[PDB]
């Protein structure tokens, strides 16, 4: 009824670093997903059922 | 009532790094799903009735 | 009725490192689902019936 | 000098005034490479008395800092030095 | 000086100036390299009396930092030094 | 100075300015290499008296920090040094 939000979060995704000193990196991906960086998703839903944030290197193939 | 949420966090992810110095690395993936890079996800749900939150590197072949 | 919540958290994930100093590695995936990296998936739901969290690097193959 | 209050309310919040730090701060080298810190001298009644008839006399708050010198028989920090060579 | 108080109310909560550190801070190297810190001076009802006929008088505070000297023969922090070679 | 309080509520929260570190902190080398610290020092009702001919007097308070010296016969913290070698 009296509601006082202060710097309160709510799907907050934050301070996501990666370093790569001197990194050497071979991909040869043929018809699949590949997932090689940094992927820093948040989410937030009012009235959201069946709701998915992230999907990240995936394959679907559903018959 | 009387309600006062300060600094609350909620479906929050933070401070997620990764280093890499020296690394050397080979992905050879034919037809399915990798995952190498730091994924951070967050996920703050209302009314949510059956809701994922990460999909990260897999393979939905469903019939 | 008299609600305060000061810094709480309620689902969070927070300071997932990895350092990986002279790390080689390799992968051959064939047609699965390989997670070889940093994942940190935090969520909150409300009303959320049958909620899940983490699809890291699975197969999902059901008929 | 921060002050925060709350007054005649109903329902209050007073609030920090303090740092926060959420989110990457990548720093390359934070070095620090012959440094110094802090001297400050606060002089109240002092009766200080100086009398040089051909030599040297300071009165200040010393503090030296270098990274390098160079040459052959160099002086870096020479506080307090008479260097009167016979040659 | 930080304050934050709540006064004359019915309901409160206050925060205080606290940090926070919530995130990545990655450093590559933090390093001191040869850092004097933390000397700081007061002086009160001093009595300095100097008489010098020649030499050398310092009333300092001496507070030497340094990293590199070159030469041969060098010579780097030389408080208090008298250098009178005879060739 | 920091204060924070709550009078006069029916549910009195305060914060007391705490330091929090959540998250990652990366440092590569978080390393001190030949630093000074902690040392400090404050004057009060001296009466130094100097009758000095040509010599070297000092009323500090010595404090060296150092990381690399070289050449033939070198010298790196001489405090109180008399070199008067004959050839």
Do not use: P, R
């Amino acid at each position: 009824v009296l509601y006082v939000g202060s710097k309160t979060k709510e799907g907050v995704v934050h301070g996501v670093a990666t370093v790569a000193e001197k990194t050497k990196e071979q991909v040869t991906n043929v018809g699949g997903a590949v997932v090689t960086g940094v992927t820093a998703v948040a989410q937030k839903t009012v009235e959201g059922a069946g709701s998915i944030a992230a999907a990240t290197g995936f394959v679907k193939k559903d018959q």
